[PDB]
Amino acid sequence: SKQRKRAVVACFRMAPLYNLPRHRAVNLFLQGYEKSWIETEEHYFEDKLIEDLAKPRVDPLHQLILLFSRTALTEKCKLEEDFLYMAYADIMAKSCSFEEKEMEKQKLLYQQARLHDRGAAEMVLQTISASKGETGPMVAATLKLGIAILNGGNSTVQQKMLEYLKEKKDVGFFQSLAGLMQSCSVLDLNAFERQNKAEGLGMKVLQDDEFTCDLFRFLQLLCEGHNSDFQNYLRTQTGNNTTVNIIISTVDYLLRVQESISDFYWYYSGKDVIDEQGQRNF
């Protein structure tokens, strides 16, 4: 194509190799060093930390969780970003032979026990209900923590959340779930086409994907172990005011993704040798 040809001319144009007067090179070295090197591993410290907070009077961890619980209970009409919360959600969420399965059940269940004594389910459950349909990185951090709590399918946390939503009766949580599931993604029709031609000329598509794989894995991890009360509660939603039959909504999201996969089929229905980008997206 056209601009690729001037790009090749520009690839010949970068003949200043290391003229680079004295400090442009140092500046670009700083850029490359920060980009490539500092992404390292220090991340053993999460187990040490969440051990170290639960050393008793109320726990410091319980003060922190209670802080975010009261902050979530304030009314804002739009959530903030709060990189305090964005740090500590990940800090908590990184803390999770037949004999080996015996051991790895119990260590995981103890690590969840470290949290859901401290009202830890309800901060996640409320901060979901705060943002009504907004899809910020806030909500992604909350769902990562909510998965890392319910990872094994603790029945006590499932019962904890059901007792919560039966007492402090809220439709705004289910309204928030419907508002989330309304967008979440579809695949694509045309942004792949534009993406491919921009890719070819200049030298994303599913930028909201891993959020959806966390949201539905979260909803899976609310009915792990067949909480038949809680499976019925999603459908009919009695104790609140107005019901939101969430299961027809997730059927509709599946129908959306179905249709867009089908439309991706027709675009490769004839050329039959699929690019790296098509496979990687697909």
Binding site: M14, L17, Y18, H23, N27, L28, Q63, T71
Partner: protein
């Protein structure tokens, strides 16, 4: 005053008077601050420092007046520049060694190397004589070392008395004892005072490695938390100055290495050296250094970085990690601001790597020549960033005009978007709208957009907002380089990539704003923006073009004869239909059509056949012999794309061009203009050859 300590009505009223005096001179009213310096009687505050029998109310009031009059402006000025980390490149900067002489401990962070910029202050004298812009000067002045030594004495005093748990202390509460004193010391620490001689003394007072191990109320340790956080930031400043000092040694080795390697490969007479030629031909120095640094990941010089990464691993951190947890344990805490300030430092002591990640895409190296322009530009930028939080527009325009005239603004165009100052400018513009201030701000951003390429990406990230205020751009000769719409138009022109990268709801906004033009002059500016939105290199895209033409077949809004009605009646409708015919001429190219039928390209091109059905030729002949130079070229470009040689010769003339070879004078604007417009018809003939030879002799 010391007898007022029980006249409680008078006490409360005078406390509110001090509250009001503090409240008035908020954020840089030096004009009012000199007047208070007349009223406040400068040594009386120094006396109210030490009066150990005043009430704590008036104690806090006078320390707040001291800070608010004499300290607040430059305190904020360094509060803004805590996070910029720019640094020169001299051997003084290279003199930094990261560490106390191959020890096994930290630096005890009161080290006075400080090769960074860290902008500086001036002071006015509050004498009452005629004006020397003294009310509008820097700030009222005050003594420094008197404050320094006496506050150190106050600190050691308050420690070695209050730790013994006196039932006295000065303002009843220890809160009224410590809180304004610690607040004053905190503000005075930031201002570059308390050098190393007394840094050692205060860190003997607090470190011993004491102050922090006392028993406290809540806002005392809130202030202590802020103190400790500033110490962490000083650690970061020292760390980054040291790593620039390392890189100054390291980079020249790599420079000499790869130039030497090039001359090695050049010198040899032995295909297989062609991959070395490939490796020496990255896109810029970016991928060059990317290969040079990623090669050390999995040359013996790479061992020095292998050392230095572990050198910049980093026991103040560990005592913080104790005492924050201890405060959370023993002393169950209300005041959720204190809880937030607790855990921010707690997380930050472990996220030193991640804070360093946050830090390094702001630091920057500058040659020793351009130092004063960097200081002056940064001072003006701090001025306008201070003016962000309020006559005012004239100060703004002065600041912008100072910014417009700097070498470093062009010598380091990375640094401007590194400051984020464009976002500051745009926030000011947001604050204006619901004057000519906007006309200067749009002018600065359009002036700013073109100075590199990747600048325009960062400018492009606001176009969702930026189109929404299109109705400001109206009938004014101060419109080019003045509309926010013109800022969006500045955000496109070069990049083929970013022209692709925008999406359809922006164009939905545009055509909703354009559908209201069912009368105007204002439509031609929208059409100018769309003309930038479709074409973009000399060869149009189709992806924007399909959507544009589709939404215009919604509502374009006898139209051929309407232009040919009102010529002689005021250029508005004339240039309007010129712009509308210029826009539609930027669709359906030939490389995807004339080479091969691509389906929908035919049907868009048929829609283009469907409108203005070659009655354009009336406009072709009617213009050319009278408005004259401009509109006809747009008609040509409409004909050149959508729409043999007999019909070519049907169209006929350049005789009026040759007829004014010396008498002109807008006729002198079509002269070279159709020396590139009448060249598209390369793809009565003797008469045209005669007229062309007449123009050739006119250019002989």
């Amino acid at each position: 005053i010391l007898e007022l300590t029980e006249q409680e009505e008078l006490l409360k009223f005078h406390y509110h008077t001090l509250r009001l005096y503090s409240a008035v001179c908020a954020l840089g009213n030096h004009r009012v601050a000199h007047a208070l310096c007349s009223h406040v009687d400068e040594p009386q505050l120094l006396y109210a420092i030490e009066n150990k029998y005043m009430p704590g109310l008036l104690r806090a009031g006078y320390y707040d007046l001291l800070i608010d009059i004499h300290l607040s402006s430059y305190a904020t000025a360094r509060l803004m520049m805590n996070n910029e980390f720019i640094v020169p490149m001299t051997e003084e900067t290279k003199s930094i060694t990261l560490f106390p002489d191959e020890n096994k401990k930290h630096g005890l962070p009161g080290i006075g190397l400080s090769t960074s910029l860290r902008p500086r202050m001036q002071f006015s004298s509050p004498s009452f004589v005629s004006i020397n812009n003294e009310c509008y000067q820097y700030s009222p002045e005050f003594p420094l070392d008197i404050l320094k030594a006496k506050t150190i004495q106050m600190l050691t005093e308050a420690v070695q008395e209050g730790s013994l748990h006196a039932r006295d202390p000065v303002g009843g509460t220890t809160e009224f004892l410590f809180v304004p004193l610690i607040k004053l010391f905190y503000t005075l620490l930031i201002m570059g005072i308390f050098h190393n001689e007394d840094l050692k003394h205060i860190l003997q007072l607090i470190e011993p490695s004491g102050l922090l191990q006392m028993k406290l109320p809540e806002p005392v340790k809130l202030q202590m938390c802020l103190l400790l956080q500033y110490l962490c930031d000083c650690q970061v400043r020292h760390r980054i100055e040291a790593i620039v000092a390392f890189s100054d040694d390291f980079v020249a080795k790599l420079q000499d290495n790869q130039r030497f390697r090039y001359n090695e490969v050049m010198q040899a007479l032995n295909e297989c050296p062609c991959p070395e030629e490939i490796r020496d031909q990255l896109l810029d120095f970016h991928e060059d250094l990317m290969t040079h640094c990623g090669i050390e990941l999995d040359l013996t010089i790479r061992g020095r970085l292998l050392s230095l990464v572990e050198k910049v691993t980093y026991t103040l951190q560990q005592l913080i990690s104790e005492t924050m947890v201890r405060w959370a344990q023993e002393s169950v805490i209300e005041d959720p601001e204190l809880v937030r300030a607790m855990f921010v430092l707690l997380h930050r002591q472990y996220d030193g790597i991640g804070g360093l990640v946050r830090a390094l895409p702001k630091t920057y190296t500058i040659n020793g020549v351009s130092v004063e322009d960097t200081i002056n530009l940064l001072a003006s930028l701090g001025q306008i960033r201070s003016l962000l939080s309020v006559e005012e527009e004239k100060l703004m325009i002065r600041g912008l005009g100072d910014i417009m005239n700097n070498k470093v603004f062009y010598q380091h165009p990375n640094l401007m978007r590194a400051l984020g100052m464009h976002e500051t400018v745009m926030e000011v513009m947001v604050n204006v709208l619901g004057p000519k201030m906007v006309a200067n701000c749009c002018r600065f951003l359009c002036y700013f957009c073109r100075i590199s390429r990747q600048n325009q990406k960062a400018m492009f990230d606001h176009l969702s907002y930026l189109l929404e205020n299109s109705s400001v751009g109206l009938a004014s000769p101060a419109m080019r380089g003045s509309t926010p719409l013109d800022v969006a138009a500045a955000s496109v022109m070069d990049n083929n990539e970013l022209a692709l990268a925008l999406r359809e709801p922006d164009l939905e906004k545009v055509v909703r704003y354009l559908a209201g033009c069912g009368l105007p002059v204002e439509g031609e500016r929208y059409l100018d923006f769309l003309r930038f939105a479709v074409f973009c290199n000399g060869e149009s895209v189709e992806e924007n073009a399909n959507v544009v033409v589709r939404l215009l077949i919604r509502r374009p809004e006898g139209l051929l004869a309407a232009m040919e009605e009102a010529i002689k009646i005021g250029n508005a409708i004339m240039t309007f239909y010129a712009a509308l015919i210029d826009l539609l001429g930027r669709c359906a190219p030939e490389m995807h059509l004339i080479h091969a039928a691509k389906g929908e390209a035919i049907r868009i091109r048929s829609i283009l056949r469907s409108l203005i059905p070659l009655g354009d030729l009336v406009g072709v002949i009617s213009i050319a012999f009278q408005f004259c130079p401009d509109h006809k070229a747009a008609m040509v470009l409409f004909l050149d794309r959508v729409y043999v040689q007999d019909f070519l010769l049907h169209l006929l003339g350049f005789l009026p061009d040759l007829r004014a070879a010396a008498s002109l004078t807008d006729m002198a604007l079509a002269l070279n203009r159709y020396l590139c417009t009448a060249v598209l018809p390369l793809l009565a003939g003797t008469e045209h050859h005669a007229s062309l030879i007449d123009s050739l002799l006119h250019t002989v």
